[model samples]
Target chain A: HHHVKLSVVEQAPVVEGLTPAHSLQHSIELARLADRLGYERFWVAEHHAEIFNAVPAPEILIARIAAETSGIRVGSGGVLLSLYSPLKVAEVFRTLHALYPDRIDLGIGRANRVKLPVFAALRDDSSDDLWRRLEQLRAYLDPDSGLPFTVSPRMPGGPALWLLGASVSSAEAAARLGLPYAYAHFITPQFTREAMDTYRAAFVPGPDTPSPRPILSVVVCCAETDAEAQRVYATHRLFHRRMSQGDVRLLPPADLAVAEMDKPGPDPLAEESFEWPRYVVGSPDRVRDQLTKMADATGAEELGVVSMIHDQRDRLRSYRLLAEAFELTPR
Target chain B: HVKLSVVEQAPVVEGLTPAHSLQHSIELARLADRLGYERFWVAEHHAEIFNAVPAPEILIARIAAETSGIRVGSGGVLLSLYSPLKVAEVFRTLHALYPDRIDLGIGRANRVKLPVFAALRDDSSDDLWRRLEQLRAYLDPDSGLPFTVSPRMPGGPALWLLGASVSSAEAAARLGLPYAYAHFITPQFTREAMDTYRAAFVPGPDTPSPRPILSVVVCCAETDAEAQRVYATHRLFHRRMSQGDVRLLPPADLAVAEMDKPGPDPLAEESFEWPRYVVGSPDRVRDQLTKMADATGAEELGVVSMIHDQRDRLRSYRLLAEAFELTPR
Candidate 1:
């Protein structure tokens, strides 16, 4: 029903028993696997004052994973632009893109990923500085922009910039700025359809951005059986709830989350108990059906799938099964 | 005669293109580790574009990935311009990945162009002192800096507050951290700053008795004339930059001797903050290098070279390393 390319976004969460170091190493290994499995891109996330994500400097991990694998676009799922010096961000990512060439993405986002107190402590003012920094970033990236100074190690082209967010306003922002757009359906699901529609309509082509480019990310979970997939989905459900509540505990065991839900913890949301309707979870055929529905409804050209599950091998297999089902080339 | 450290300013000079300067730094990092150089440090120069270095830690991480057996670090990360907590997270991650092989050398300079400083920095003089104290607490894992970096990580980067003045020396000493003297930056104040640091230094559970580090520039060759020829670029480039001509490092073959004849342009350390270079054949350079180390009675010398020719820079380092009989890992 749908013909869409695929990518992935990962928090590289610290597991219940594994150390952060081990969790990150496994994530790197997964990146290599994704490359061979023909995923178009792989992105790691950014989190501060939170224990769930092992990666603090996404560029550092990006550089390492880039060295580990070949032929795949590597990048920060999103950099909190307000917390860093605009010039520093420009310098870091430009150097990275210079190093890897043609395979880097610098996804710039507001610090919406952090808690409000932590965000303030990070000294961020996304409302004012977000656009200011992005404007500065746009200037730094374009040679024709009359840049303030040369970002050393200047290259032919810089990293691909994706303005990341989840609302019609975010879509409009990317369009007005003429950058590639990415919608975090997993973060703000209710607005995905309207956001993508707004982005495609408002997109303005420019020298750097020749055409409209948008990617939609949705939560996904897959296993050999529907029952098994649902069981895997239970833990991630709890994990996401804990993350929002300022508690970053590792993903509980598959049996643990459901058992705890039987008790009183965030209520696990009565309506979306097993899984959200848009969150595709089931066997390969069932997963495909839901994803096809997603592609058609949003008219998305590409999709970035994020899956949080307990067993490491099952996580790898899920991506593998989708690649096989979609007949994706090992590119 | 003495153990040596290699530091680089990574100039974006003429013969050495910007791209090549980056590659050369990485090459030197690998060479230093293989040649058994004690440590390889890169300087951070934001304003006044004579030096090519921008992000010191970024370059350090790349070097760390490519090399083994040598400690990689910033000669000094300009501490005042950036957030201390952010700086702490970055170094923490670097140390976590490289572990025990990363050095965090921090410094606060007062004379940065006000506009340039305002970009990432402000009221930063008093702010600088406060941040330094605040940093010492935050970076001390036990101090419970209230911020979580790298989630449950242990130990932070070894903090060394770098400076060329007595005040900076006192800062490092007061913090009970090892102090590094900028012999290359200010030879006039080297002895006093070292003395201040040594006198004020206190032993703590984490840090040992004080051992001061001296940083200098070394350019060596097979013969004195050749080394001097190689070093001609510095004199020419420094003079040009000192006079508002921030050009690439001049070609070594340029009229360096003719420079005594001149312009209304003022010069010297004020116009250009370059430390004097120790240049000559291996023995001459080694003797001069050893003399500075002894006169200062410093424990280690962190050396930096900005020779114009890429090949000669590598050649000089190789020659100097052999002269010192430094270890090869």
Candidate 2:
């Protein structure tokens, strides 16, 4: 039985022949669909100078999506905490919480790899200690934390804060802080159970977080049939293969990617060390079962779905299928 | 006829929550859209308990979505705190979402405290003009940078330099961008700034002639006496702010009574006898604004509202629109 709640983490992927504007619009459209499909929460990710992803400021995108969709919580899946001012991030999310009460989530993560220039431009003197920055952010968000200067608007309620990570150290930090943890299984495929176990065992109840609730985020590709799902996943596969070879480009059409995948003489990724089975690919019934088993094994209360299908319609269908399989109640 | 626009700071008021202030902004934005306002801009403030808007781009995106025709923008983002490429990307995305309906009004005021600036990683040595040039370069599709700002479009948001001093005016003139003088902020420098902007204006690719907009605070009522009383709240609000109180705005009755109750003026040295903001009957306010606009050769008039009551503020805007004979959207 599927008991985990379904949510979406949009990467704002640029499909073939579309501008970044079109990609962002597609993201908003997908969020609206998720809202209507009984998805629990919708999140946007942050990227910088990545031709594949369009969103550098997730807060800006989050504001638009939150305004467009109703009945669905909206937030950044993980704003790069180290690259920004803690007080500024607090104020931004606090302002968002004021705009849309009880529907905003602030998920913080360590910085991702970026070009040195881009990183310097983002934060020239940023502190390398993420924990110190996290604590400072918490202090700013708290009303009675009693800092010298107060963040303005002085609203009573603030956003729900979660720590997004792919390792046990992040999970431990989240637990020690009594914050919710979201394990990024999609990024690091082998640490789901270890991170979840660490989080569940060490979580200390705080005022905002009274219980342990872990979210397992994974790459999901679903279609009407198993073969159809794998065919669409070719785009993601070939893209990753190209990324490994430092040939970053716009996503190719799935049909073209499928052809290249079928006639492959040698594995492009074989030269580098990597892991397989990073994603769950199958029909609706099979995906649901596999997802349920993964959740059961890790005791994850929520499932964050990341679909990288090149086609927008197929991506929407993939989410809808998961929602139906999980029997989520429609609003 | 001069174009009319709005700049809202979403100031919190007594007996009303900050959350309500943001909600009121949405309502006010919708009303402005239907009432034929040319544009609705939001201001940026940091660590100020009175004003609720710290991120104007966030509010701009929300406002653009709720309204139909009126342009939405930052009355000026504090560009000193951010990278030019980042600002360009965000505004470019906005332009893509609502093409030809976005404005990027930029300013160089370091309004935050030293600690806040340090926290924001803002460098004091960084020059504002250099930042402005870099921002323009990223926004341009043909700048030929190594990496492109996302959501590239044929045309980007209209950039305007918002300032209140002669130096800022000349900067805008040299750059050949539209200039929005903050008459509401520093009434003393209005004439010099406007004169400098117009006299030194150069023709750029987009701007041929000097385009200047005057931003003023207007409070109109059925009677001059009522308008004056309503304007008292704004005066007292600033008075309290100068004294470090930073309290929410009080009603006109309360403000008028408090002034009568007697208090020392913390800003007495800087205060003047002339009315800082326009306040009078609808006809009187209209004539006064028109005279100022005519003197400055301003092509547009941007008004800001700071009344205690929301409906009263809306009514003030409506009276101004009617007085100007603006076509309803």
Candidate 3:
């Protein structure tokens, strides 16, 4: 009924009792699953200064995932551009594109606030502007930009560059730059409609992206029944609650989360408006309808799902349910 | 027989794109793996337009995924340009993914242009020794840094210090890390550096003995004259580089330069401070390599063959492997 393609945004989450190695290995397995299940793309997240998420260098993961899979587009959901040299990003992605040709993406983000020492250790200069850096990255990728230096492994048809944002300003910047925009509805669902509107309204045709391309990314939990899906989504809720209480922890199992939900001290996030129901949680039919409604409302060309389930099998099952619900053709 | 390895810089040629150079690098890496080379290392050279790889770690991961049973590493990362914690996390992740097949060889060299270095936000003020120490500390699980390098493993990548001088050799020895001296970079100091490494070696808890390797530039063929002819490309490349032409010259229609023909003192100084290349028939090259290894007590010989012709490059490695009789696994 709709043309919104499906993709996955994997956060290499190191769950309780498991190391990052297991998380990373599972990430590759999930990418292979997505590839076999006919997902359009598989993107890994770049995270640092945390124990829950293991991937600090998503390009490294992107390389491995692309090598392990055949037909799926592999890339970083968002590399923290503020922390790195734009030229380095260009060179790395250029190398990736050279290796995998037409199966790579370079999604970028103006990184979130990091601790002072950690940021300094990343070799970031706060004075450097993100927009200027983005422009420099574009110049590096453009062969005819007349840039003084070269980003090597230059290949025809480089990786697609997309601006990933959770706000209207980011959307407008992406639109003005004539790059594809990916709205993080999972992070900030309230701004989804306005950001999408701002992007499409401000977009001007450029050499790289002639038309408006918007990808709406959200958290999804699918199961056999709405009750079961909500029960499973409680784990995400408990994780969010723990995060609010300054207790950053891995995702708890659903049963434990359900038990803890009753024993919570007035619920740390009870009064938060941007709380539960932010993510879509239901059976296959319900998930399809809700996801389609969001896509239609935002005019998102693609729907990227961020499923943070604790169990690897359940996480794979969630994606499989989304694919079956969307009737995506199997590879 | 001495253990042999490969170090590729993936130089872009006159008529080919960087894409072709990278593919050629992979082709060479796969062939090296099949021929039972000890390891395959990729070089990192930024702002040099002709060199395809700006990030050797990325290329290392790609090549590691492409081949099996062959250790893949950087030949080495320009450690002075990056943060130690960041480099540690990257290699840790790589080790976790590939397991036992990853090596992290770091160097203190920062040959990037000034403007590009500034772009990388490396002010060129930090001491290489300090950073190297910090990187080793971070890579060690028991060092107890403020923050932990993630993807924790029982063991991290096998670390090696790469250089061409006695200072680097001493640093590697003092740190109890494996040392790889770049004989091709400065052949005059190779014996001195290797001897210094062995004499100054301080065995760590993990590393009980000194491990040293020599990286040499070589060209092997069926005959000594044919090897010299093929070596013409490298000689021409060096000449062009000296003349401010960085692109590699194609092998076809290449004149055999006078310098390609070795004299009685073939190890005499060349343009880059020393005779950087060893070119001869496979058997002759093997003898030269053994002499060097015997002289320096190098555990392995890393052959850096920058032949312009793709087929000739592959054939050069094949001939070298056959001459050495590397047991193919």
Candidate 4:
């Protein structure tokens, strides 16, 4: 069935020698490759003050990526709307739409309070006024702003707005606003099913959206075999574990041997792998089964897959297998 | 012999498109890379409403990543008040990130205002020489000291001293840094600075073997009148900046107005000197630049042509590239 959609999350300024420019260059190439391979939208993450990652300005990166690639939709999984003036956000996304036309999306959300230094740099005062700011941003993007200011180059008209979240609050917000909801299953798998249900139930038909829409992200790692896939996935799990524990360190390529030897505990690597069940790691057939199960469980309108293979060749191989198994056709 | 290259400090945020900001950078680098330009350098500026290129390190890293086999360097990085160690670390990191594709050109002036910004970043005007020397020590791979700078990546980009006066030349000589005189700022100081650099020159291991390298600025448009019209925007931008009216934004469609606007301060008038901005037909530009090069003994020329329109900018570069018979790098 055509029940699944695939997308990739690209972050630049990786721990390796990749700088922001290089990261952006690599990301654009990846997006082009993804589009060619029939992946849907390519989303970038928003992070600041991280020396290793460079995509602090998601709108800027999204616009650039959209311009470099054809057919693939480009946007942030979510931009930290709290840190920005809503007018500024509207102007940026509007400009992106104007340039690329029908290939832009605006994913809005509250800021993730991670590093204090980064938060300070971003100037996030508090979450108290978040809802108000988000609403203001929506208004600015609306054609009703009487001011003559044009967010050049204006897109065909308006952009597709999606509410991105890992909690019920985000889903509820999306449903109340009648915007599409994108569940970040990669980060918080436990809340995915409930959040989707809440979104669909509460969704209203706005002038823009006819009905409710749900997009789910699944952290998938595919290889030649289930065993090989597991090995490749161990590295990502290790990375997640470190992140959960607040150990902000650059990730090296995954080593299966190290992953297998480690015992389950509050270790950084293990904590990251807590949601490993949500990830699809296997051959094409096995991955298909896992993805289908995920799709059925959440009743998602779109499926986003995260493939992090150490070797570029293997990464392409994994994507090829998933595309074949799901029978995704290039548009 | 003449060479053609693309020159932009960096696009500031407010007036730029994402395609113009990020994609444009990559596209230009790729074009320069393919066209065989001698070197590509991005400029550094801060806290201006019309500009958004606050971070040169990040921009340089991005350019290096997208380009291969072309020399990429900063047009000039304002290093007057920043910490030498931090500056060294950035270049070290850049060098490692792009290997031989990076160039680091340091300047001695402060290019920003807003006292709060300078204070927040802890920038001071004092102790300029010590800072430059400290940066030199850190970058010297042979400095067998306990302190070692490791970039996330491993190679080091070449370094040059950029300035518009004798003070910068002396500093570069004291530290044996390669020198680039800013003809855009001090066209009059060009010959004097070149002579001072050559007189005070002490060859070092990092110094280019054959002779020292010098660069100047020239703007070439399709026609002399077209080039003058394109340069009017820069004059407007400079006029606003000099009046302490940084936030007075201009719309893209604002047509060029009369140059002799009343109520401008002396600083604005001085800043908008037409001689500094060389705009003309290819023949006129070539004649003027050749004269400047001859007088200053400049080996390389860095052209800074700011077109109000991007298509015009691209076309200007294309024409300049063709005129010089220079392949895009």
In order of appearance, the predictions have TM-scores of: 0.91, 0.94, 0.93, 0.65
lDDT of each: 0.75, 0.84, 0.82, 0.63
lDDT of 3 by residue, B1-329 (tens): 88999988887877787878888999999999999999999888886757888889888988998899889999998877777778888898899888889888887665678777766652332377788778778788888656656767778888888988888888888889898999988877988999999999999747899998999988998998788788876666666656565665557336364444443223333443334788899988998888889989998999897777888889999998998889886
> What 10-residue stretch in candidate 4 chain A is worst by lDDT?
A147-156
Best model per DockQ: 2
Rank all candidate structures by their DockQ, best first, as comma-separated numbers.
2, 3, 1, 4
Q: What share of the true interface contacts does each candidate keep?
A: 0.25, 0.54, 0.56, 0.01
* DockQ-best of 1 and 2: 2
Measured against the true chain A, the candidates' chain A TM-scores are 0.91, 0.95, 0.95, 0.88
Better of 3 and 4 by DockQ: 3
Q: What is the CAPRI rating of model 1's predicted complex?
A: acceptable
DockQ for candidate 2: 0.60
**Which candidate comes out best when scored by lDDT?**
2
* CAPRI rating of model 3: medium
Give the C-alpha lDDT of model 1: 0.75
Going through the candidates in order, their DockQ values are 0.37, 0.60, 0.58, 0.08
lDDT of 4 by residue, A131-208 (tens): 677667677667656543433333246667877788888788788888887887867877777888898888887658
Tell me the TM-score of candidate 2's A chain: 0.95
TM-score of chain B of 2: 0.95
lDDT (10s digit) by residue, model 1, range B136-239? 66567677545566645666577776788888788777778777777667776877888888888877537878867888777789999898788877777666
Residue B202 in candidate 4, Cα distance off native in Å:
13
- For candidate 3, lDDT tens digit of each residue in A207-311? 767899999998899998988887888788788778877997877888888788877454543555542246788999998888888888788988888987888
